[model samples]
Target: TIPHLAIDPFSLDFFDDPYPDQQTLRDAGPVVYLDKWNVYGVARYAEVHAVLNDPTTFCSSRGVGLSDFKKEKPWRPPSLILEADPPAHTRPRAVLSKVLSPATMKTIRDGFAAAADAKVDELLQRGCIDAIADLAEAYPLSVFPDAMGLKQEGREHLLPYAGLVFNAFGPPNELRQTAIERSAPHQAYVNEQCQRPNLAPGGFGACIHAFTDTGEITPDEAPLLVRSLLSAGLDTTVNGIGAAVYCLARFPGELQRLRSDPTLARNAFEEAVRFESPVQTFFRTTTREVELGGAVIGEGEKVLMFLGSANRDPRRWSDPDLYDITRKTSGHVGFGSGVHMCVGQLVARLEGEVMLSALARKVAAIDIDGPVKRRFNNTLRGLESLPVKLTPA
Candidate 1:
């Protein structure tokens, strides 16, 4: 039998601080059964990776949330990409892959790099600032909405909606409940922006709608498919950038190394994600009985794969807790793995790499100006405010 623990992984307190609890779970066993949520957990890197890769066995169609949308009405329509299986996930995945592909990214790369340079110039003038609000949040907010060709007004709802979508993956706790209330307006705004007429002609939104012309998708799917952009694209990149900025402030030595060789900017960002995994846990339902860690997870059991914990798991990483940009972090589960891996990761890497590269070129040193305020969410790990003082290069 799997080790059963009474820990409430979905509690607000747990969300605010998860490392100690995550370590506790990893230390308990390779597989854990959290009695409070009645879900099995795979906290170690190996098992978590296995679960993500074996999505056919550990299915996603039943709702990645605790509610099991097959048994309960989903809060909204399930994402064709995120909450689906192959055959169902196939065409949508192809369309999204094309939209966010390396080719598509190149079209915006120079402009994106230029914008980051401008933002860094502004931050240098400020001397001290909240990296989250000023750099991390602002960069993605400035670029992604425009990429999707969404109007400036009501664009604020994108992050809130994305946050809500991630939060709803947890149990129906107060946090999830609050997101439900908050997301109502955000959801409406996202839907309105996804309309064919409202979308900009050459943007990602219009790209999704384009699939309709080729019969790759129907008219109905274009909006929900576009909804995936609003839900997945916004918060993840913000948090990833926030996590990177926080990493630099926390480890001045690494920041100095980055300053010396700005080419390491991309590695630094990837290492930051490995160190501070922004997108933490994504739940998948077991499609059938399976032996993992010598324990049986029966059909229909929910398996919570801890991407953050797995990234930090000592079993697969050397000096796992240390923030070393030079370390090879290719296997980190920060953006997930296997078929369900983040399709927008290319966009995220582009944004982080460019922004950090510009900052590396312009900023001399990052000194902690004030205490870090962590942002607590059910499924995302990031700072609400990262106070720091910047010295220009």
Candidate 2:
């Protein structure tokens, strides 16, 4: 029999600390029904991984949220790649893949490193700083917008826009409602920024728009594709970087392991991603009657996959709770799995690697200076303020 729980995963209390409830859900069964939202939740590693990989059955077209696109309209136009299944999803994914390929990232790598170096130097100069504001948010906000060929003026709106995008994936809770109300200006700014005319000559957005010439994706679809990149890229990274820093500061042994071998900086970031799971839960609708976790779920039913919970599942990983940078972390769903895996992952990794490597090389220790403040989001986990005092190497 399917276990039913009345847990409101979208509540601020859940956001404050989800591990206990996540444990409860995982232990309850492979698939548990959340009576609060009338949806099924998959918290174990096997079930969540199974659901994500079988996207043909657990489709994204019905909106990867509580609001099924078939019944209710989305707060904004659905994402071309994130919200679409195959055929509709195919072209945009191809275009974005080409646009953000590793080769394209290579072209920008040196510039990104230079920026990271400059920022780290500045942070070293200040000594004491809020890592979230000074390092996590500041680093990406400084570099990524420029890489996307965005103008500097309205860049402030990017985080708010990305936040609203993630919040909209949950139920219409106060968090989602507040984000929706405050996001009008931010959303409009992002929409305008996605235009080809607004992008620079050789940026990521420009590259995405260029696919129109090759007929891979239409001109109309180009801006939306750019929108997909912008929406999916920023906040995830800001939180991701914050998570990495927070992990390093809290776990001195891992920090030493990283400081011992700065090459492990990338590993540190990867481990933090797996350990922290910034982009937590995402909902996928069942396209057909599917039997998952010993239950026959009807077609069009919503199934919530807890990416965070899956990452920490003892069944999948050894010492799942430990922050070990050197551990092999190839299969983590932190950036998700399968074809719908994060398209912005390469960019996020590059940012993370560059920033962390810079920190390992320039700073000896990351001492937590004061109270750390967590930023609560329905779908994302991150720190609002990470006060830290850095000791320069």
Candidate 3:
């Protein structure tokens, strides 16, 4: 039976450092009733994975937030793929999947890798840098916008816009309110950029419009599809990159291990995601009466799946809290699991591997000079500032 360890989902302590609470919840049972949020929650690896993969039983249609989409004002039109179920979500996903296929991504791999190398070389020459701003944010901001065919002017707003959107997925709180306020002025520009006439040729945005032109999806639905790319694509990767740097800095011998063989870049990024998850939690609603870990989950009720917590679940991982690049962590749910899993995962992974390889090739050691400041959002785990000193190889 589930323990009556009802905790406030929005408490500052829960957000400030969630692992201890996560551990308590996981140990308590597979599903803990969160009275504060009025929902069931899965904190263990097995239960969370099961819920994510079984979308028919645990639907995302009610919305992935505390407020149900059926009753509340949606923060944005629900994500075309992320918020949708099969049949409705299939064709659009197919179109995007084709566009971002392995062969296509492979064609651009060399250029992406070169770009990352050049950025690292530039930063290394400076002798000292804020790894987050210089390497983590720099590479993706430089490549992804142009790759998506966004115009150069005012594109700087992407990160902040993504920040607001991710935070809005949580409870209606000060952080959500603050993000909304910050994104207000830029909303117009963002909306304008989603149009066909505003999109650049050979970019993902334009491809989405082409899908509409071919009657694959309605013209009205095209913009939201592209918006999904923006919402899920940018800041998550930027923060993931920053977290990767932090992992290398904090873990003993990881930097030297990477330096010995640059191929460890991919593993390093994956390990970092396991250690410090970028996207923390997403909600799934129970479609019918079901019991998980001895707790009854009623139909139409929401269940929060903590990705960060599951990634660190001791039942599935030894030394779950430790950051080890050499650890085998292939199937970790950092990008999520099953049908609603991140479609742009390959894109994010490539960006991480490229940047980390570049940094590995150029820098001998990275030292943390101060405490890393975290930018807390409802969904995204991010770094506000990661102060580091990069010693050149």
lDDT, candidate 2, equals: 0.91
**Model 1 over residues 1-393: C-alpha lDDT tens digits?**
678898787776877888899999999999999989899998999999999889899888998878787688999988898999998998888889988999889898998898899998998899998899999999988898999988788877888888898889989888899989877788888888888999988899998898887766888888988989888998999998888888888898898899899999999999999998998888999888999998988998988889999998999999998999899999899998989798999999999999889978898888888888878788888888888999998
- Number of the top candidate by TM-score? 2
Q: What lDDT tens digits, residue by residue, belong to model 3 across residues 27-103?
A: 87888888666778888899999999998988877888887887787866687787888868887787677667687
Residue-by-residue lDDT tens digits, candidate 2, 45-89: 999899999989999999988999999988999888999999889
Error of 1 at 393 (Å): 0.9
Considering only N, C-alpha and C atoms within 3 Å, which residue pairs clash in candidate 3?
none
Measured on C-alpha atoms, candidate 1 has an lDDT of 0.89
TM-score of each: 0.98, 0.99, 0.96
Where does candidate 3 stray beyond 4 Å? Answer: 213-215
Decide which is better by lDDT, 1 or 3: 1
Q: Which candidate do you rate higher for TM-score, 1 or 3?
A: 1
